[PDB]
Structures are given as C-alpha cells and as structure tokens.
Amino acid sequence: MKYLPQQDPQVFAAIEQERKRQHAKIELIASENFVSRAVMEAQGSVLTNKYAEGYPGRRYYGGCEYVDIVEELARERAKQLFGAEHANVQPHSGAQANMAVYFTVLEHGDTVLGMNLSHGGHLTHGSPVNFSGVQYNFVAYGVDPETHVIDYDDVREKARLHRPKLIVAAASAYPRIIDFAKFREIADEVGAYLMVDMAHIAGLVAAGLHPNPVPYAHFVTTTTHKTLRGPRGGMILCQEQFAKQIDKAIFPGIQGGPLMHVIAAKAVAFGEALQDDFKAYAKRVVDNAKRLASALQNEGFTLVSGGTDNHLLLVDLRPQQLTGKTAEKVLDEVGITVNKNTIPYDPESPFVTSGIRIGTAAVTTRGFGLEEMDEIAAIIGLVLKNVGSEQALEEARQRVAALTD
Amino acid sequence: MKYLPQQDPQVFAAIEQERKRQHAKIELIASENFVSRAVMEAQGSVLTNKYAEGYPGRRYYGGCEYVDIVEELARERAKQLFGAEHANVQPHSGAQANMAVYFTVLEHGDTVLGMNLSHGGHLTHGSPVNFSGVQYNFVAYGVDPETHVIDYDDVREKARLHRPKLIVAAASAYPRIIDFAKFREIADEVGAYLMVDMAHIAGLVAAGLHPNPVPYAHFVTTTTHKTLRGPRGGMILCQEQFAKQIDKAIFPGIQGGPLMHVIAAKAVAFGEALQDDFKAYAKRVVDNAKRLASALQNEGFTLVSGGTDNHLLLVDLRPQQLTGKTAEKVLDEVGITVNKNTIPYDPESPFVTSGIRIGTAAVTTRGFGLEEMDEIAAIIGLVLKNVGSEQALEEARQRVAALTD
Numbered sequence: 092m093k094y095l096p097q098q099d100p101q102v103f104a105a106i107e108q109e110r111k112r113q114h115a116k117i118e119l120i121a122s123e124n125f126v127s128r129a130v131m132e133a134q135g136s137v138l139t140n141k142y143a144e145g146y147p148g149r150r151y152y153g154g155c156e157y158v159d160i161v162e163e164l165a166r167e168r169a170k171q172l173f174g175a176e177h178a179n180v181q182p183h184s185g186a187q188a189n190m191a192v193y194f195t196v197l198e199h200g201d202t203v204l205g206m207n208l209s210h211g212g213h214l215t216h217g218s219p220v221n222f223s224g225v226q227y228n229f230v231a232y233g234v235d236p237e238t239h240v241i242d243y244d245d246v247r248e249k250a251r252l253h254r255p256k257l258i259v260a261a262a263s264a265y266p267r268i269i270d271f272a273k274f275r276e277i278a279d280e281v282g283a284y285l286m287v288d289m290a291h292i293a294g295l296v297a298a299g300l301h302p303n304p305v306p307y308a309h310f311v312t313t314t315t316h317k318t319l320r321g322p323r324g325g326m327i328l329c330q331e332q333f334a335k336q337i338d339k340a341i342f343p344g345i346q347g348g349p350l351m352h353v354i355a356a357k358a359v360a361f362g363e364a365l366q367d368d369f370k371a372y373a374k375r376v377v378d379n380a381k382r383l384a385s386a387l388q389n390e391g392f393t394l395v396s397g398g399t400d401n402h403l404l405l406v407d408l409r410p411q412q413l414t415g416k417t418a419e420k421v422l423d424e425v426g427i428t429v430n431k432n433t434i435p436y437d438p439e440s441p442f443v444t445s446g447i448r449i450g451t452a453a454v455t456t457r458g459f460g461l462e463e464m465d466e467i468a469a470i471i472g473l474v475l476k477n478v479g480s481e482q483a484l485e486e487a488r489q490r491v492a493a494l495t496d
Numbered sequence: 497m498k499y500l501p502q503q504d505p506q507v508f509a510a511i512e513q514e515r516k517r518q519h520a521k522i523e524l525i526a527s528e529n530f531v532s533r534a535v536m537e538a539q540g541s542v543l544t545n546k547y548a549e550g551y552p553g554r555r556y557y558g559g560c561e562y563v564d565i566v567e568e569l570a571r572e573r574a575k576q577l578f579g580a581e582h583a584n585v586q587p588h589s590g591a592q593a594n595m596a597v598y599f600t601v602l603e604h605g606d607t608v609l610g611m612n613l614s615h616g617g618h619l620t621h622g623s624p625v626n627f628s629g630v631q632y633n634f635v636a637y638g639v640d641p642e643t644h645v646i647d648y649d650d651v652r653e654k655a656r657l658h659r660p661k662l663i664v665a666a667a668s669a670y671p672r673i674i675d676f677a678k679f680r681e682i683a684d685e686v687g688a689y690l691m692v693d694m695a696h697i698a699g700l701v702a703a704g705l706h707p708n709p710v711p712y713a714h715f716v717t718t719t720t721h722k723t724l725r726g727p728r729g730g731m732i733l734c735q736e737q738f739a740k741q742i743d744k745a746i747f748p749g750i751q752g753g754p755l756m757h758v759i760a761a762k763a764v765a766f767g768e769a770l771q772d773d774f775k776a777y778a779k780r781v782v783d784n785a786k787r788l789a790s791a792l793q794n795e796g797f798t799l800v801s802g803g804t805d806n807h808l809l810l811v812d813l814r815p816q817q818l819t820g821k822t823a824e825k826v827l828d829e830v831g832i833t834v835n836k837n838t839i840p841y842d843p844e845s846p847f848v849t850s851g852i853r854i855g856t857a858a859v860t861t862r863g864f865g866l867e868e869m870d871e872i873a874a875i876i877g878l879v880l881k882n883v884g885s886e887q888a889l890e891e892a893r894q895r896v897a898a899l900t901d
C-alpha cells in the first residue's frame with residue numbers, strides 16, 4: 092500500500108491489523124475464504140468511478156464502452172462455469188440476488204416453501220425478521236430428527252399442504268448433498284417455481300464436487316465469495332425464459348448502479364474457477380472437511396448428520412455441556428475463528444445456540460491439508476474439553492501459532 | 497497492478513482501457529467523480545474476506561476486532577461531517593439505503609409523497625418500475641412548468657390531500673437548492689415523516705455550500721460516491737430515536753454481511769471531506785457549475801430552471817432539435833461523456849429524452865477551472881449545433897485532447 096498509509100494512518104492501521112489477524116488465526120468460518128491479489132486489484136481499480144445503470148449495450152449512461160467488456164466476461168465465464176442459460180452478475184449481495192428473484196416471481200404475501208432456519212436454512216429463506224419473512228408467507232420444511240438429512244417426504248407434504256408459488260432449496264448450514272432433482276419433482280407436482288440458493292456450495296458445484304442445480308432449477312442464486320472464492324457480491328443464473336424479468340428485477344427494480352469494480356473481480360474469480368487447479372483446490376476442501384469431521388469425532392465430538400459431504404460441519408456441542416456462544420468465545424482467544432450456529436431442533440435459541448459451524452475453504456486456500464486438519468481438531472479438543480484452564484488455553488495458543496507460523 | 501495482468505489479460509485490458517478513457521474524455525456525468533488512490537487501496541484490501549453481519553461490538557461472527565474499528569471510524573467521521581446523531585455505513589447502495597428507510601417506517605401499500613422522476617426525482621422515489629412504486633403508494637410533487645423550481649404550495653397541497661406517512665425530499669436532476677425547512681414544516685402539518693435523499697449534494701452539504709438536511713429530517717439517505725467523492729455505496733443518517741430501528745432494517749432486514757472493504761474506503765473518504773481542502777474543492781465545484789451554465793447559455797443552450805445553484809445543470813435540447821439520446825452519442829464521439837436525462841414535462845420517454853445532464857464534480861477533481869468550463873461549453877456548442885459536420889467533430893476532438901492532454 093502506498094497512498095493509504097500516508098493519508099489515513101488510522102484506517103491503514105486497522106487494515107494492517109486485519110491483514111495480520113487473517114494470517115494469525117485459523118479461520119474456520121464456513122462462509123469465508125481468501126481471494127487472490129488479482130481479485131483485489133480488480134476491486135481496487137478505477138471501475139468504482141463509473142455509473143453503468145442498465146446492461147451491456149443498453150446502458151443509461153455514456154462511456155460504458157470498456158465497462159461493458161468486463162460485465163460480458165463475467166457473464167460468459169459464469170455461463171461457462173455453471174452452464175446456465177443466462178446470468179446476472181450485478182446483484183450486490185446474496186441477499187439482493189435472493190430479493191431480486193423473489194421480486195420477479197412473487198407478489199406481496201405469496202406463499203414460499205424454504206428450509207427451516209434452525210435446520211440449515213438462510214436468513215433470506217423466511218426469517219420473520221428479514222424482508223423475505225415480512226414480505227411473503229414462508230412455510231418451512233426440515234431435516235430428520237435423528238439423521239439430520241432433509242426429509243423429502245416433509246418437503247412434499249408441506250408443498251401439497253401449503254401449495255407454495257415457489258420452493259426454495261439450499262442452506263447456510265447443511266453438511267449433506269442437496270437433491271435438486273427431488274426438489275424439481277415436488278415443485279412440478281404442485282406447479283411451483285424452483286429456486287436454488289447455491290451460495291455456500293457454488294465453488295463445489297463449479298468443480299464437479301456437488302450436483303449442479305442449474306439443470307433442475309428455474310432460478311439459481313449465489314454469492315461470489317464463499318466456496319467460489321471471489322469478491323463479496325451476488326449472482327443470478329436462470330433459464331432464458333426468465334432473463335428479461337430477472338434483469339429488470341435487478342435494474343430498474345431493486346438496485347441502482349452496479350459495482351463495476353466488483354463485477355470485474357467476479358470476472359477474475361470466475362476466470363480462476365474455470366482453471367484446472369480450482370478443481371484440485373475444491374477437492375481438498377471437501378477432503379479436508381471429511382478429515383476434520385472424523386478427527387473431531389475422534390476427539391469425542393458430535394456432528395449434526397454424522398459428518399459432511401461438502402465444505403462445512405456442524406458440531407452439536409451439548410455433550411460437552413457447552414453452548415455455541417462460549418465455544419466461539421473460547422476459541423477466539425486461542426486463535427480459532429468459528430461461529431456459533433444453531434443445530435437442528437436446538438433446545439436453545441439463535442443467540443446462544445447449541446453448536447459451532449466449521450468449514451475448510453479458507454484454511455485449504457492457505458495450504459493446510461489432512462495432517463494439519465488433525466491438529467486443528469486436537470486443539471479444539473484440548474480447548475473445549477478444558478474450558479477454564481489457563482494452561483490449556485496457552486497450550487492451544489502455541490499450537491495454533493505453530494500452524495500459521 | 498501486479499498480479500492481474502498475468503492472471504487475467506482479458507480483464508486487465510478492459511480495466512486499462514477504462515483508465516485511459518477516464519483520462520482522455522471529459523467526464524461530465526453529474527453523479528460521477530474520481531476517488532483518491534487512498535480510497536481505492538482500502539477497497540482493494542483484504543477486508544473483503546471478512547464476514548461481519550451485525551454492528552461493531554455486536555457481530556454474529558468472531559474475529560471482527562479490526563473491522564469494528566473500521567466501521568466506527570466511518571460512522572464517527574460521518575457524524576462529524578454532517579452532524580448526525582446516528583449513522584449507518586452499511587448500505588451497499590443508495591438504493592439499499594432508501595430501501596432500508598422505507599422498510600423501517602413504511603408498511604406495504606403505505607402512501608408516500610416523493611418527487612416526480614421527470615422533474616428531477618430519483619428512481620427509488622416512486623417509479624412504478626421500481627420497488628419503491630410497486631411496494632408503496634407513491635404520489636408525486638413537481639416543479640413549476642415555467643420556473644422549474646419545486647412548487648412548495650403543490651407539495652403542501654398533495655400532502656393534505658393524500659396524508660402520507662412519509663414525504664421524500666430530494667433528487668437526481670434538480671439544479672436548485674432544496675428548502676428543507678419548508679419540507680419539515682409541511683411534514684409536520686400532516687403528521688408525516690420526512691426523509692431527505694442528499695446523494696447528489698452530500699459533498700456540498702459537507703462543505704457548507706448547500707443547507708444541511710440533518711436538522712430538519714427524521715432520516716437522511718446518501719450515496720458516498722457523488723459529490724462526497726467516496727467509494728460506491730450508501731449510508732443512512734438519523735436521530736437516535738430511530739437508530740435501533742434503522743440498524744435492524746439494514747440487518748437482518750434487507751442486507752446480509754456488509755462490504756467491510758467498502759466501509760474502509762467510506763471512512764477514508766469522510767476523512768478527506770473533513771479536511772480543509774475539500775471545502776475549497778466543493779466551492780470550485782459549484783463555481784464551475786455556475787460558469788459552465790452561463791457558458792452554455794452563451795452558446796444558445798436553454799437550461800432547465802435558468803442555471804444551477806449546485807454541481808449540476810440540465811440542458812433542454814428541444815430548441816436545437818435533438819433528443820437526449822442523440823446528444824449523448826455525438827458527444828461520446830468527440831470524447832465528452834454526459835448522460836441523456838429526461839426534463840420536466842418531457843414529451844420523450846426515459847431512454848430517448850430531450851435533455852442532457854451535466855455536472856462538474858469530477859472535472860473539478862481533475863483540476864479544471866473557469867477557463868476550461870468556457871472551453872467545454874464552446875466545444876459543446878460547436879458539436880451540438882453541427883451534428884452532421886464531420887469537420888466539426890474532428891475539431892472538437894482536438895480541443896478535447898488539448899484539454900485532457
């Protein structure tokens with residue numbers, strides 16, 4: 092950094108603190124990752140200066156000649172990656188992406204079937220304190236009480252009982268592969284659209300390690316920053332019969348000017364995803380996730396669903412008579428960054444919760460493999476099973492320190 | 497740029513073309529500007545990797561220690577700048593800022609008084625192809641058909657007729673000062689809330705060159721990238737009495753995790769506006785708009801409202817028999833970037849228009865003064881009064897190139 096340190100030592104100090112913390116801690120938040128320098132250079136570019144309301148070739152402003160190239164690259168690399176018919180790379184968030192789809196297909200008060208929030212569903216899938224749950228009438232479907240796998244009989248029963256205008260599939264915390272085909276079938280049965288929110292698993296879908304929802308859904312929404320390893324932003328993929336409406340939902344509907352600089356970073360992120368070692372990288376996340384789980388089970392921990400088929404895991408903390416809030420706190424001292432997360436049928440609420448959610452995308456990006464996963468679990472065991480021991484804490488500290496050197 | 501040109505030649509080439517275009521053309525788009533290198537560096541930082549749903553000290557994730565300072569610098573510097581009691585620096589956009597205000601105070605279908613889109617109002621101030629107009633009952637107030645100044649008598653009439661729950665004040669293409677005192681007076685008569693969208697005029701308000709709306713409005717919304725000269729994003733300003741409700745609207749309401757990297761650049765831009773130099777700048781911005789308006793009228797051009805009191809000016813192109821769309825394309829041919837803009841009581845639709853909107857924020861940023869403004873209007877007169885003349889176009893190009901080097 093050149094001009095920042097000289098003009099804003101306060102902001103620069105904060106960013107340097109953050110740049111060091113990212114290397115110091117062992118980052119297990121499942122949502123997170125670390126982008127390349129190419130990706131940062133694109134969002135730190137001068138594309139922030141351009142107003143480009145509209146779409147490539149159909150803008151509301153002059154001079155969008157070169158910013159149209161960047162959007163088309165993003166769109167055509169996105170279509171190459173997921174094999175969708177159309178792509179909208181302007182959504183600012185995963186939330187704005189969801190909001191735009193819902194905007195396009197639903198009316199105020201329509202009924203929507205989305206995954207139960209404490210079973211794995213996301214905020215924008217029906218929380219009553221989110222716009223989705225205020226704007227629309229969401230009914231939830233859940234996971235099996237003992238296997239913690241989506242109950243497809245439950246999904247079809249809710250579907251037929253509530254007759255939803257659209258069905259949402261996917262999650263923020265479900266460690267198992269989601270069967271898009273059954274979702275498509277149930278929706279056809281009741282004449283509902285299908286929306287797949289692939290945010291968490293988009294990089295895994297991209298590398299062939301998770302079934303692709305594109306062939307089965309009308310609308311596919313994603314973030315560009317979780318397993319896809321891109322800039323913070325959103326994206327909508329859809330059949331070409333919904334394209335004109337999807338694009339109008341984004342603009343002139345819920346958004347204003349896109350973030351061309353972030354759209355250039357999405358373009359770079361997708362570029363990286365199309366390359367062969369992204370497929371390689373993705374396999375290690377999933378392998379590392381598998382390994383981490385097993386290592387955790389060996390330390391005596393209980394995992395919701397018994398393990399994972401993707402990048403994240405959900406620890407049911409109860410048997411260490413722990414809550415997810417203290418677990419989270421405790422590991423933040425020793426350098427492990429996780430996030431408290433409700434568990435299916437959690438006996439407590441989503442402010443305290445009974446578990447921690449963990450993922451390997453970030454550490455895998457920094458080069459950790461199987462044997463370093465074994466140690467992460469070891470340290471989590473040492474720490475969580477001996478919560479007030481200052482000696483356990485400090486031991487934890489050197490071992491984390493030994494991993495991030 | 498270090499890694500981009502080697503990682504991604506296709507993206508790098510388009511970013512580089514944009515950069516060249518930004519220097520070679522005369523960027524007159526009124527909502528555009530050029531950010532500092534310090535601002536871009538913050539945007540290209542590692543702060544994009546951090547999930548930070550929540551607010552500083554009240555996150556739903558660990559490791560937010562540094563990002564919390566980033567967000568407090570932005571809020572505290574914003575409050576210094578505009579004297580608000582509370583500030584939300586999380587809106588991804590000016591669209592999302594507005595949406596969060598509406599989500600907090602209005603209930604689906606509620607009646608809102610906003611400025612008409614063709615007399616100057618913004619898309620999110622009631623357009624029927626926008627969520628604002630689809631989600632709420634928007635009635636519009638307009639400008640005098642002769643003097644093109646907001647008709648406060650009209651505002652007050654509609655308020656009493658329609659008794660909205662909220663009155664929106666401000667715009668995208670009004671070139672005169674907005675009297676916030678009368679707006680609040682009217683809102684108070686009819687028991688409505690008053691929200692001011694100062695997106696276009698934040699830098700001026702910050703600099704003491706436009707009456708500040710903060711003391712008259714319950715809510716103040718703004719973008720950070722227009723006359724404020726910050727990164728692309730939004731911000732909400734409000735009285736303590738509404739803060740909690742405003743923060744909840746942004747999250748868990750309408751957004752997900754914030755763009756922490758973008759909040760870092762907002763804090764940088766607020767620091768820059770807090771400096772003494774920024775007041776010099778904004779004074780020149782308006783003086784340049786005054787001089788370019790007068791210069792424009794010397795070449796025969798009619799201006800909506802007779803001139804400008806701010807950073808913006810609107811050309812009614814009817815007298816010279818051209819559409820807004822035609823003027824824009826021709827001016828793009830000689831290297832002058834503007835945007836077609838509807839004009840009050842426009843006989844043309846929003847993609848053709850009978851006018852062009854011009855602003856001096858960005859060219860002032862790049863150092864242009866009074867004499868360059870005389871040249872610009874001369875180059876603009878030359879071109880729009882000789883559209884068929886290829887010899888006129890080449891001359892124009894050279895004068896542009898002489899101005900931008």
Ligand SMILES: Nc1nc(=O)c2c([nH]1)NC[C@H](CNc1ccc(C(=O)N[C@@H](CCC(=O)O)C(=O)O)cc1)N2C=O
Nearest residue numbers: 144151343613616617618619625668669837845846847
């Ligand atoms: N007064 C004013 N308000 C604004 O909100 C605004 C400006 N000017 N100028 C520039 C920028 C341009 N935005 C637009 C974008 C779409 C439409 C819109 O009404 N489109 C209609 C009909 C257009 C057609 O001819 O294709 C639609 O059907 O899409 C209008 C202004 N902008 C705000 O961003």
Ligand SMILES: Cc1ncc(COP(=O)(O)O)c(CNCC(=O)O)c1O
Nearest residue numbers: 122184185186213262263290752753
């Ligand atoms: C399934 C799913 N869908 C949308 C989002 C929204 O993203 P944002 O950029 O934050 O608006 C998410 C993000 N989840 C946060 C987390 O999992 O921690 C998501 O998982």
Ligand SMILES: Cc1ncc(COP(=O)(O)O)c(CNCC(=O)O)c1O
Nearest residue numbers: 347348527589590591618667668695
């Ligand atoms: C008055 C006014 N209010 C909000 C916005 C929103 O901005 P964005 O970041 O693009 O969502 C704007 C934007 N102006 C567009 C234009 O005037 O060029 C605005 O003017």
